[PDB]
Amino acid sequence: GAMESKVSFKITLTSDPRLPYKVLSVPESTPFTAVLKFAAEEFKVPAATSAIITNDGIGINPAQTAGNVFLKHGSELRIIPRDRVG
Amino acid sequence: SKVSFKITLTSDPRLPYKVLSVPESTPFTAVLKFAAEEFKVPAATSAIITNDGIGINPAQTAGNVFLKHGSELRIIPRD
């Protein structure tokens, strides 16, 4: 195919005891900010305040292709929504 | 063997881009079409140009396009 290879991530909402998840397949050249927004929406949580971290407690810099994240941290990611104030 | 292109939809202020690799013999018409489809804009009215404002004749091999203009191209959707 002419279309770029995809990498896939298993993103878990660890905050939910059920450990639900969504698998996203994403073009390697995609800025990770797009992946985070897409994931937040699938989980119905605010993209602007949520974060994606690795299973070993590293924060993922969103200014980074999906390819890089895949290559450096593999496919198991966690989505972290913020608490509320007051 | 394949050559690769970064095509940026510059009319989308988010500047989203896609990467395409096609066999260096591929007619550039195929890439224009492919790019159109992926970008969800009409192949018939879309153009592909370079960063420096040169229009790419699609009746050319992707290989030759790569050789003359490099990988950085813009897709220009009609009105």
Binding site: K22, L24, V26, P27, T30, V35, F38 | -
Partner: peptide, 9 residues
Amino acid sequence: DNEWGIELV
């Protein structure tokens, strides 16, 4: 919009 072509699986 999904202008980066992300797919759910």
